[PDB]
């Protein structure tokens, strides 16, 4: 690329910047209760500042068994939802499954009534288990892709699907009107394609409710699936076409929120793609989000009610493609140990979600130009800039500027961009500093490190350490901001790359306490420490300091690369891991937060 000027005006807040992208998903002693999945969700929950909130999960009702011919056993569903709750995640609760073979036909009147009973009983159960306010946040959803006809020995016709929906809607209503239901979770192709999709909208708009006979049925949001076929802008372009058609065909759905809860670059999660392994995927993901913010949600004339975007990448990878599949983590099943164990590696895409999470509530004015020509996000180089207004003494003013350099699925190992970043209008404040974080394939690719090591199928302890050293972005220590609230940077960015510039004033109080610390075993001499940042109170963190106590209760530092990710795999050279651990936050001014409550561990 030729030289790019990126201008940010921190004195010019424009409108809200909603964090609409904080979702993932996957499709499966059940698979969801395995140690693999328990590690996976710890990693998903370890993205700082609720970077991922929703996990859209298929086949949740295959976790339920039936007794008689009528009660339900929820044990396996309890387990999975408890697992999500523990990681402070929410289910994208697809009402999908046959309750272990009980449900077979949704034109059978008896079964339609039984389905409603099941939905009400499960919603009431989890309202009881977690509280109404918590379950009210859950997106309940119809069966996935009803036009792809993926029903396991379940008969679902046009009419059956409508009856099934009414049972869903009425079931949730009986439990609480506060609970939210949407669908159909399909593509909405040009009619007569996607009949079950357009049929749901028509039924909700004008159709007869199966249970009550009234015209029209509740539909809290419309969820579609649009993939880009390797193009980022293509996702947004297809979405606008579908939203416009809905707007014009359904007057009542004018303000009904639209979700794209499978907005991936490419169909087929398990297909190996080199670009899925590294910062190429990461950068494209940011690019898609920047495109949706700037070209759809920001002051647009269209004003389509776009509410949620979900990357469907919580899947677990398999041999022989640990890195090359559409997944947030790279999974290594190390079978040559006694017993065999599982290791997860954080992929750049997961790290990039942590950079996105640093974005705040107001979008700042920013301009990207090339030799005087202004370029929108429909280009190789783009930007999202945000600001935070101080609320409590635990936080002060912040700005976060995320620059991407991405040519979608194409990586260019030679290609680089000369960028001039010009930031102005940072308001006066105490102890103003800036921190840069940078990702690219040369420096921050665990996959690149894996290949550098000869692609060991069963990596050694040291090989895992080396690969984990490439998870975090390269970061410069905090530098004091020059007076006048201005900064010029001339970085060289690769294709692909991400660059986050974080500018922060000094809060009056140090960070809050780390909470919910736990220790999960990996294998002999190794464990994962995971914690919550719910109460730290600010995003201006350099690292989380970890301490270890062997002897009695005297704690000593555990030396490590700085990281803000709420998880650390502890793998000392001595293998000595039994004892107590505590974690505290450290801010940009070297001020520590209070230590978490200690957690005991014994092999
Ligand atoms: C260490 O030990 C672990 C187990 O502890 C092994 O993990 C297994 O690895 C294999 C791959 O080597 C996994 O099998 C793969 O499953 C994929 C998905 O399977 C599901 O979906 C298909 C339909 O889409 C169903 O048929 C199936 O029942 C499952 O529901 C498949 O897509 C893969 O198929 C591909 O590869 C095979 C070759 O293996 C080809 O024949 C096919 O054409 C296709 O390309 C594949 O079968 C398996 O799921 C893993 N098991 C577990 C429990 O995790 C590791 O392999 C082992 N490590 C080493 C080095 O041996
Ligand atoms: C539910 O099923 C589990 C097996 O998954 C079993 O252990 C449990 O006892 C069952 N619960 C009831 C109430 O029957
Ligand atoms: C994106 O750019 C292409 C040309 O590269 C153009 O045809 C298309 O209209 C643009 N789309 C949007 C949504 O800006
Ligand atoms: Cl993809």
Swiss-Prot record:
Effect upon mutating residue 453 to P: In MPS1H/S and MPS1S
Positions contributing to alpha-L-iduronate binding: 58, 144-145, 227, 262, 268, 312, 326
Consequence of substituting residue 565 to I: In MPS1H/S; reduction of activity and protein levels
Gene Ontology cellular component list: extracellular exosome; lysosomal lumen
Mutagenesis or variant effect for residue 343 to R: In MPS1H/S and MPS1S
Cellular localization per UniProt: Lysosome
Glycosylation sites: 73, 153, 299, 335, 378, 414
Sorted UniProt keywords: Disease variant, Disulfide bond, Glycoprotein, Glycosidase, Hydrolase, Lysosome, Mucopolysaccharidosis, Signal
Entry annotation: catalytic residues: 145, 262
Chief place of localization: other
Reactions that this protein is recorded to catalyse: Hydrolysis of unsulfated alpha-L-iduronosidic linkages in dermatan sulfate
Enzyme class (EC, first level): hydrolase
EC number: 3.2.1.76
Similarity-based family: Belongs to the glycosyl hydrolase 39 family.
Linked pathology: Mucopolysaccharidosis 1H: A severe form of mucopolysaccharidosis type 1, a rare lysosomal storage disease characterized by progressive physical deterioration with urinary excretion of dermatan sulfate and heparan sulfate. Patients with MPS1H usually present, within the first year of life, a combination of hepatosplenomegaly, skeletal deformities, corneal clouding and severe intellectual disability. Obstructive airways disease, respiratory infection and cardiac complications usually result in death before 10 years of age. Mucopolysaccharidosis 1H/S: A form of mucopolysaccharidosis type 1, a rare lysosomal storage disease characterized by progressive physical deterioration with urinary excretion of dermatan sulfate and heparan sulfate. MPS1H/S represents an intermediate phenotype of the MPS1 clinical spectrum. It is characterized by relatively little neurological involvement, but most of the somatic symptoms described for severe MPS1 develop in the early to mid-teens, causing considerable loss of mobility.
Subunit and interaction comment: Monomer.
The protein's name in its UniProt record: Alpha-L-iduronidase
Organism placement in taxonomy: Eukaryota, Metazoa, Chordata, Craniata, Vertebrata
